[PDB]
Structure 1
Amino acid sequence: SPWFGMDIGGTLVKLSYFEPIDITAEEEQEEVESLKSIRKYLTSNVAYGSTGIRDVHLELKDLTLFGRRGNLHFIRFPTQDLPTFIQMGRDKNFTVLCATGGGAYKFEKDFRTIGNLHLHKLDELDCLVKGLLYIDSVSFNGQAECYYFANASEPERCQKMPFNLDDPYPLLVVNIGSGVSILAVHSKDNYKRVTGTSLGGGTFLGLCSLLTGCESFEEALEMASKGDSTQADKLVRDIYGGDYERFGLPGWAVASSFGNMIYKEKRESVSKEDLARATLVTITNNIGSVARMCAVNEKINRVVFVGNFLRVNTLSMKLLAYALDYWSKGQLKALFLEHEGYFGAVGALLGLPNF
């Protein structure tokens, strides 16, 4: 029985797979052909079908788990293609699946079309916390799982640097997926969802597809990297002529996101790249402001950002870093994690002894 953990989100399916590497001569000879066939397919390919990708760089090598040495693999595909994944799962050639995310419920009846399959569902928040605390405790092949941006307010000094979660309590976890959930973790047993926002990575991608015609998340990020968001955004200085110093708003801060788009003349001169950047900046800053308000409210100064909205997205990471640093006068730290999108999948996999 292959060891999988699956987090089925609104947008992406995330899959963690533990490949045993201590396979004895007897076990290897007595391996079922279809089980041996899955292991070879998963480790001999980095693209699966037309939409599955294995994030080779995230692999945890020579991990001990359930008393076996093996490697932890990380795989992702769009939730839209889960039916293809399932139809191939029913391939005549071919087992316990721990699943979390909204789609463990939505697609429960579909998984049970695989006759030799028992589906155990696990709570999304439970799996996220367990997964995060586990990955950080085994480290990233000896490197820190958790990093931050030192001197996030100074550009010529800003650089990524490791961060130590040896005691990670208390902790605010901001999960930026399709939407946004915010968790307060006080201990490994005491955590709660304190709020969320529907203005998440789906909002960026949805709005940006509407405004610019971009076809992918990556194309949107690369358009955004070429844009100037101040072309679409009305700034404090467009209203004051300078700074609003009585309340500490500098002239370059955004007063109204997309506020310059109320003028036909400005809508006509704005580029898709500007709009892509304005969308990203607007979604990111609003998340950072909500996160800041929860942190102050929960009296928690470490805020960890996870989820896939930040994959290959350094612009948002820096925006979040700079924003928490600036508005909090340094008392709030934005924290990031190499395995950002996969913690639910890992936490699900860790629920395997419970069945």
Structure 2
Amino acid sequence: SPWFGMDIGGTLVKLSYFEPIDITAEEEQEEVESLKSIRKYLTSNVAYGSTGIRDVHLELKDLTLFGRRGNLHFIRFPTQDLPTFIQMGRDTVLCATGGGAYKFEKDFRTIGNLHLHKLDELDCLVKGLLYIDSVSFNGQAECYYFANASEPERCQKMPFNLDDPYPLLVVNIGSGVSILAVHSKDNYKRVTGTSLGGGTFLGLCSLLTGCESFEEALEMASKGDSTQADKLVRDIYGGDYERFGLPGWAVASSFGNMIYKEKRESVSKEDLARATLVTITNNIGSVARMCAVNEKINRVVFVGNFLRVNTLSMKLLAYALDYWSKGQLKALFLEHEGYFGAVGALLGLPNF
């Protein structure tokens, strides 16, 4: 049977598949056609149906897992299209995590003799993240940060070493946000969460601008000016608020200029997309900073798919965490951002 791990989130299903590359002559003969056509279908296509995507650039090659050499593949599709996935499956031990492992448990069991083992979101995320960093990204660092995030002429992606990764604050930006404090391989807790996450950005953006995809929303935001919608410290004070070290450019009230009808009439959809992105991102950064301070942790790693192909938000998080913490905290990012739960699920396979 094929080796999958699946993280069924509120928005996206993430799938990790291990493709063995040490298939012997005897093993190839003694393999069932449906197993052969699964591997063929998955490795010969990068789009699956109309909404499935293989993130080819993330592939881990020549990985030794469970005593086999193979390639680790990373695949995603909308949770909305899980019925299509299950129907295809009805035309195997499945380790699954995320809320959808519970919600859609009965649906997966419509696949005859399929064994569904549910694993907790937290153990899977932590196990997957530590594993991927431990095997490296094909010899390159899995973890990176933005050096000199204060000056834009100097700001550049640089690798970051996590050989001793503890303690770690993990900020998981999915539909919502979960915040975890990791003190060791077996000692971690969910510190808190916020409901202002990726689904808020996408939902509000679609309401305000009519955008029809995550990528279109980011493309509108790259052309916008959030200060058209937001009220800044200088709009209230006429400059800096010296007494409390608030610069004139800080946002005092997100969307706060939209209380005036004349401003609502002149703002562009691109401006509103950017103000939505900036509002959500800054609020995540601030919550992350308060949790780091309370947990006494200075390394904050951001994961989840809100940050995929989203350099605006990454740079904003890098700059804001460094500025508002007076350099006490480092914003850290990971190449395999959205897939750690799916990997951790796959890694629970020996337990069954």
- Smaller-chain TM-score bracket: over 0.9
C-alpha distance after superposition, 1:199-235 (max 9, x if no partner): 0000000000000000000000000000000000000
Separation in 1, partners of 2:116, 2:215: 33
- 2:277 maps to 280
Write out the 4+ residue segments of structure 1 that deviate beyond 3 Å after TM superposition: none
Q: TM-score, normalised by structure 1?
A: 0.99
Q: Secondary structure at the match of 1:31?
A: coil
Separation in 2, partners of 1:144, 1:197: 29
Query: What is the CA-CA distance between 1:5 and the residue it aligns to?
Result: 0.1
Separation in 1, partners of 2:167, 2:242: 34
Q: Secondary structure at the match of 2:286?
A: helix
C-alpha distance after superposition, 1:71-120 (max 9, x if no partner): 000000000000000001000xxx10000000000000000000031000
C-alpha distance after superposition, 1:289-316 (max 9, x if no partner): 0000000000000000000000000000
Separation in 1, partners of 2:74, 2:236: 48
C-alpha distance after superposition, 1:240-278 (max 9, x if no partner): 000101000000110000000000000000000000000
Q: Secondary structure at the match of 1:186?
A: strand
C-alpha distance after superposition, 1:296-350 (max 9, x if no partner): 0000000000000000000000010001100111110000000000000000000
Q: Secondary structure at the match of 2:83?
A: helix
Residue number among 215, 233, 241 corresponding to 1:218 in the alignment: 215
C-alpha distance after superposition, 1:147-191 (max 9, x if no partner): 000000111000000000000000000000000000000000000
Separation in 2, partners of 1:89, 1:116: 12
Separation in 2, partners of 1:305, 1:182: 9
The count of aligned residue pairs is 352
Separation in 2, partners of 1:140, 1:202: 28
Structure 1 segment 157-172 matched on structure 2, within 5 A: 157-172=154-169
Q: Secondary structure at the match of 1:336?
A: strand
Residue number among 266, 269, 278 corresponding to 2:266 in the alignment: 269
Separation in 2, partners of 1:307, 1:143: 20
Structure 1 segment 305-320 matched on structure 2, within 5 A: 305-320=302-317
Separation in 2, partners of 1:249, 1:145: 35
Query: What is the CA-CA distance between 1:195 and the residue it aligns to?
Result: 0.5
Separation in 2, partners of 1:62, 1:18: 10
Separation in 1, partners of 2:122, 2:265: 44
C-alpha distance after superposition, 1:3-45 (max 9, x if no partner): 0000000000000000000000000011111001100000000
Query: What is the CA-CA distance between 1:143 and the residue it aligns to?
Result: 0.2
Separation in 2, partners of 1:96, 1:325: 44
- 2:129 maps to 132
Q: TM-score, normalised by structure 2?
A: 1.00
Q: Secondary structure at the match of 1:223?
A: helix
Q: Which runs of 5+ in 1 are unaligned?
A: none
Separation in 2, partners of 1:245, 1:134: 46
Separation in 2, partners of 1:328, 1:250: 14
Separation in 2, partners of 1:162, 1:105: 37
C-alpha distance after superposition, 1:46-89 (max 9, x if no partner): 00000000000000000000000000000000000000000010
Aligned-pair RMSD on alpha carbons?
Answer: 0.3
Q: Secondary structure at the match of 1:340?
A: coil
Q: Secondary structure at the match of 1:75?
A: strand
C-alpha distance after superposition, 1:130-150 (max 9, x if no partner): 000000000000000000000
Separation in 2, partners of 1:160, 1:263: 40
- Indicate yes or no: 2:291 matched with 1:294: yes
Separation in 1, partners of 2:158, 2:80: 36
- 1:353 maps to 350
Structure 1 segment 1-355 matched on structure 2, within 5 A: 1-91=1-91, 95-355=92-352
Separation in 1, partners of 2:160, 2:152: 20
Separation in 2, partners of 1:26, 1:34: 17
Q: Which runs of 5+ in 2 are unaligned?
A: none
Separation in 2, partners of 1:224, 1:234: 18
Separation in 2, partners of 1:241, 1:335: 35
Separation in 2, partners of 1:84, 1:322: 41
Q: Secondary structure at the match of 2:339?
A: helix
Q: Secondary structure at the match of 1:320?
A: helix
